[PDB]
Symmetry: D2
Subunit: 373 residues, 4 copies
Amino acid sequence: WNSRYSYNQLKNKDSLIMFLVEIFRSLFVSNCIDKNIDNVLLSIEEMFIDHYYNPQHSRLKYLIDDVGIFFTKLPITKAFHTYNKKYRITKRLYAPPTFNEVRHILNLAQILSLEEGLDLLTFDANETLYPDGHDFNDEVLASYISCLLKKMNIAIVTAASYNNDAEKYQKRLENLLKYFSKHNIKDGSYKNFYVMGGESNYLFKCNEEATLYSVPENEWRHYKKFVDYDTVQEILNISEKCLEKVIKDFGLCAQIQRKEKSIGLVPNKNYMIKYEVLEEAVIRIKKEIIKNKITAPYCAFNGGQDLWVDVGNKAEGLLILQKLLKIQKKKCCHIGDQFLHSGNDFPTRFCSLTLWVSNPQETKACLKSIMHL
Amino acid sequence: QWNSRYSYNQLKNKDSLIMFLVEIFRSLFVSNCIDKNIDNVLLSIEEMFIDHYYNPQHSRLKYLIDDVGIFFTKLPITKAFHTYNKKYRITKRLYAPPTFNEVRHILNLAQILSLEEGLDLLTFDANETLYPDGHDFNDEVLASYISCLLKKMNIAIVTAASYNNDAEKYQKRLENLLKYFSKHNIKDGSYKNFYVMGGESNYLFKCNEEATLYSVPENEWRHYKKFVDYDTVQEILNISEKCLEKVIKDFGLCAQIQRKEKSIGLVPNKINYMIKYEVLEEAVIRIKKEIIKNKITAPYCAFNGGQDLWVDVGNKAEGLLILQKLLKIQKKKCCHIGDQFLHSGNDFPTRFCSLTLWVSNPQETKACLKSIMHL
Amino acid sequence: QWNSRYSYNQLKNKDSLIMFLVEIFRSLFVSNCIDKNIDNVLLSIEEMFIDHYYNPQHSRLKYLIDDVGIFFTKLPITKAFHTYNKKYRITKRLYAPPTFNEVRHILNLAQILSLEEGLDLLTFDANETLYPDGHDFNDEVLASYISCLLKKMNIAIVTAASYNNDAEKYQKRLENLLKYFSKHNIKDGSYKNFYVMGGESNYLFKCNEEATLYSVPENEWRHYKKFVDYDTVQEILNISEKCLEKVIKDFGLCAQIQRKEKSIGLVPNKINYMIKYEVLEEAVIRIKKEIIKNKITAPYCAFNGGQDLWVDVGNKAEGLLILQKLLKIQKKKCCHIGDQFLHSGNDFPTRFCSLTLWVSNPQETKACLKSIMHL
Amino acid sequence: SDMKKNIVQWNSRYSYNQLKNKDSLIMFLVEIFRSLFVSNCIDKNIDNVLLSIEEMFIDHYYNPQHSRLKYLIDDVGIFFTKLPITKAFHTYNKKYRITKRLYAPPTFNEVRHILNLAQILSLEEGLDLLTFDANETLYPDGHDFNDEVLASYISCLLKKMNIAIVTAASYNNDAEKYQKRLENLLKYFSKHNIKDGSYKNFYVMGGESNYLFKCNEEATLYSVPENEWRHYKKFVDYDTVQEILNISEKCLEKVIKDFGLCAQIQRKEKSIGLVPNKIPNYMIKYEVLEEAVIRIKKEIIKNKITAPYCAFNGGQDLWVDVGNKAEGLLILQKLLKIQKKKCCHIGDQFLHSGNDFPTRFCSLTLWVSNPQETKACLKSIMHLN
Ligand SMILES: O=c1[nH]cnc2c1ncn2[C@@H]1O[C@H](COP(=O)(O)O)[C@@H](O)[C@H]1O
Ligand SMILES: O=c1[nH]cnc2c1ncn2[C@@H]1O[C@H](COP(=O)(O)O)[C@@H](O)[C@H]1O
Ligand SMILES: O=c1[nH]cnc2c1ncn2[C@@H]1O[C@H](COP(=O)(O)O)[C@@H](O)[C@H]1O
Ligand SMILES: O=c1[nH]cnc2c1ncn2[C@@H]1O[C@H](COP(=O)(O)O)[C@@H](O)[C@H]1O
Ligand SMILES: [Mg+2]
Ligand SMILES: [Mg+2]
Ligand SMILES: [Mg+2]
Ligand SMILES: [Mg+2]
């Protein structure tokens, strides 16, 4: 699930997205991008199916060595037409398609592949629902989530750990539960709504009063991979020792914060820390946990201007709900922003469909496209 | 010297000089020797930058990097890396290599230390470097750094914004700046050393002793400008507007065409609806390639900046060229500060006539000025 | 006309137009659609090759590739692809994309199929495209093609080989070709359409009724040669000679310098001790950068042969211009076959005044002539 | 890892990106030397950079799985010795003076030479077994041994260490047919080596790990009893050999129909080959041969065959052998009780889809282009003591 951290894996943006960018770029250069390129697009699709069936020996694997596993047949041809007709990006003559645009097309393809249905949908609460640290105050998208909960399960998986205090999480979602009591409380859908804490440590359901409450540990401790309490603390001690050198190596205005099953450094009044120092820290931390031969599920991610290390994994959270709610991976989806190799949403590619979002407005465009299907 | 070199390599690849240094530091990073005395590497890079100042078209640097700008000064790249590294210690990194923005600051500091001969003119890009885009200047810290520099040399505000000759609408954009000038820059003769250039090189302004900007007559400095008649200025507009109408049609865009004397813009409206960044690039080249189709050699500039497109019949290099001819200061002692230093930006042509400092936000301009004053 | 410069990036990728097609085909190969009906991609490429022929200054091909030369003819790249594909089926490859050299064969074929209007002059690099380096002509198959082609057009031998001005030396190179001309090309007047240009563009020779070369009177063709005086010729030789004498020292070369009137070169000692190809490519750029440093503007050429280096006062581009002005031949009716079309090769400047076929061995030239005869 | 795992990853975990760059480690040094040349500092004293490169090489000798070198280059081999890349650069540059170049950077082939020289200098602890790729490194492709100078070096080394010849040539068990390829070498061995006991130290391996021969006191080559060394080799069922041979054979037929080729299919026991038709020899495209090797490999895994094989490109030939040169080296290391640190191999096919590539998994390797380069190696090897 990790330990494949390579130099080449860091400097290059994305294996799959750039793969389509370079093909579109050459198509743009040959001046044939506006003509019917269905022959090219379907051959791209012909591979995506061959990678769905034989993901270990597909030709897509020979071209791109580090491809994730495809859980559905991706209609990349329909995804291009639908995105093209709306934005007319092919109408350009001097500006090639952008990595960001191909990520948009790739996300649309994963939505159309859900023609068989969708049983579970999860969100990365931070920066995909509301900016870093801010509270939920966008009333528009809350109507989308309420409608989808009527036809599927909705979960919130966010690396923010507030221990087991269920009351603290409501302040982050008070406006959301307010919309649930007005519509979902009459329906029978409110019980299908869950919230995950840490990355996979604190689970809360939803009561009849649109109130978040803790879940008995005996209801899902067997679904979670049991980890020695001594090993958990060791991971934090390895991290706490590593961050001190990081703050000592580069003189910076921050300090370390300790919790139960999670630690991270946060800049104090705040004085920003370079994006590369946080990148350096994740690889420093990972190489040490490798050196100590720790196999427990963990994660270290570079999100915004703070670094954290949790003894949970955002993929284990999806794995718990699937084993708990009797849901397959092919009918599971997750929306997040940290989809780089130093992000905590990347592990979700190993067990669920994924949608890469840069700001909460794109989640509105994501769910809006999902609904009209 | 028309900037007509619209090249696919200019759009596809970033700054030539910066990425040249990044790859070198990357090999120094990968070889594990970046934390040792790498002075032998840095000295040869300086040896190259020195010879480029002498033979810019036959240097080994121009053979390596074709399409280099021009070095108006001898650049101390060794001392700049030495002093940048001591503050941030990027070199103590083991798994993340030196990045693009880091070398951007190193080259900025390299240009700053090159002013051992002295500095006689500063220019500031108004929007995005002195205040956020579409805002009024609201900063007391920045104005305090500028005030001390105003006594040492002449300072100018060269912007791309255009209000037609109305000096009252310009002081509104930088109210708190004149307020600080009213307090500390009146007794000194520095009040007669501050300039403001609206449009792009079209509307020149100055400061009165009562600290409210006044517009300078046209007949005093219009002769320094390139003679562009009113008929050709409007065809550059007309051809542009015809191209923007195609852009509103070719792409579903909720955008308005703002027409003024000597300028055309592309602005959306809120129900603002954000235009795609890549269409802006596509439209800039459409306008430039269409103007050359009519053999128009008039100094113009079409640029995508922030969230809107504007085409001015002035040039932001002309503005710096005007002030160099007015105050009789060679290009060696003139420096510019802006955020639009890509091929699509409007601060780029100043590389042809003045030293340049690449900045992304107002906080870096304050960090720029603080280092420029400990000289 | 002037000989253009070079960037270190331009020295890497041998030909930009060829490389421009390779990366397109590679994305076609990568996308799994290479062996399907890809004519939309092919015809669109032809659309830019046509638009660059009609408007070479402002074309999208000029926009994407900055150093694109001049298309003297409409290039049928779509038919050339199908033709080369049907023979070798390079599109049936699944795990290896089409190569640089394969596109070279296609680009040559597209240039050949563009000659539907006709040819008036065909020229041959003598060394390495008619016979191995430094050998006498020995091939009857190839001789029949040149013989049959000498009936329908003019045929000239343009080689940088310099034997001053005695046709006996040049005949030893082309003995077996001239004896074949006696048996078939004398009953008619075809031998009066054969030429041999000595020393790139310094010596001219014609054929004679006895199947023997003679030197054309200097007055008959000297006015087209851009005059270069004894002083300027000797400055180029001396500036070069000084460079080679350092090139020998720095790398401890086992080689010698050979001086002639209007030419100088670096030859290995007899034993034939191999001399590094990298040092040869360096000696070109060392000399070229020195000649331009001394403001020399005369037509010269420093080229990197297989096992030696040579500098010649004159070049094959001017040599073709001499023949085109001699026989009143238009540019669009000219063609040249050579082996070194790298930027440091004496056949590269022909791109500026003729159509070109890039070959690497005498076997590849027969494939060109057989394809040319079958039209 | 274990050799069975390496062969599994070699014939099943290639990549288009990895097959583009010939060697990941040579390209590693080329990029660094490129920037050093681009930075203009490459002609000054650069022990600054080189020593740091050596430092990472040493850390990789001790910690191959979690080293900084393995971070930068994902697919590094395993270093059996400490490479003095600083001395190899000093030694190679003082001869050729490639740092005096101002407008031409060092090439892949030069860094390949420096890396060979570093591998040679790493043999300070001594050498006990030296093996040679026969075709194109001892004599041109398809020829017989007709070089006197080479025999003088090999005979001199034969007195000091064990010598072997691992080749892809596959004459079933006719030692007279192998003698014809090297008769001038055994002719020199008879004149200068029968006096020593060194002729017993000389071995020849046919097939690729299938046939073995030793030198007689009469300088003649004789077959080695299979009861003496069959056990060291991983056994392959007769049904699985012909399965490999047949699944390959079907592909060469498709390659001839796809691309119109004047070529034939030679069938032997434990070996198939795609050989070209005679001229009245025709030439087969290099990219087609490279294409078919991937075609062979891609289909063998589709049939879930895991036996050790080797599909390889021989310049003008395409062959598949049940067996590989890494297996043949293991058998000689198990036969003469020789550790990998004191064994070396010289060959020309060190690319992926190459004959001598699996040698990197169990020996020191020298990447040589022709017998003239083979001499420069053995000349530098003799200069050690
Ligand atoms: O251990 C935790 N305790 C409190 N906050 C955390 C913890 N881990 C991550 N965070 C922060 O909360 C957010 C969680 O990331 P997410 O996966 O995008 O929701 C980020 O802004 C983190 O900086
Ligand atoms: O002609 C003009 N009239 C009014 N606004 C303009 C004009 N030209 C540019 N602008 C806007 O004002 C900004 C000034 O750019 P800057 O001062 O160069 O950073 C531009 O980015 C546009 O948003
Ligand atoms: O100046 C000259 N005099 C005599 N031989 C020359 C001269 N210049 C070049 N050569 C040799 O003749 C060859 C002509 O090559 P070509 O131009 O490709 O025909 C060169 O590669 C040199 O070996
Ligand atoms: O199985 C085989 N039997 C006979 N000849 C072979 C066989 N395999 C390859 N060959 C040819 O013989 C050469 C010997 O290979 P090498 O000795 O490893 O260089 C190859 O390059 C092929 O041309
Ligand atoms: Mg997030
Ligand atoms: Mg700006
Ligand atoms: Mg030649
Ligand atoms: Mg071999």
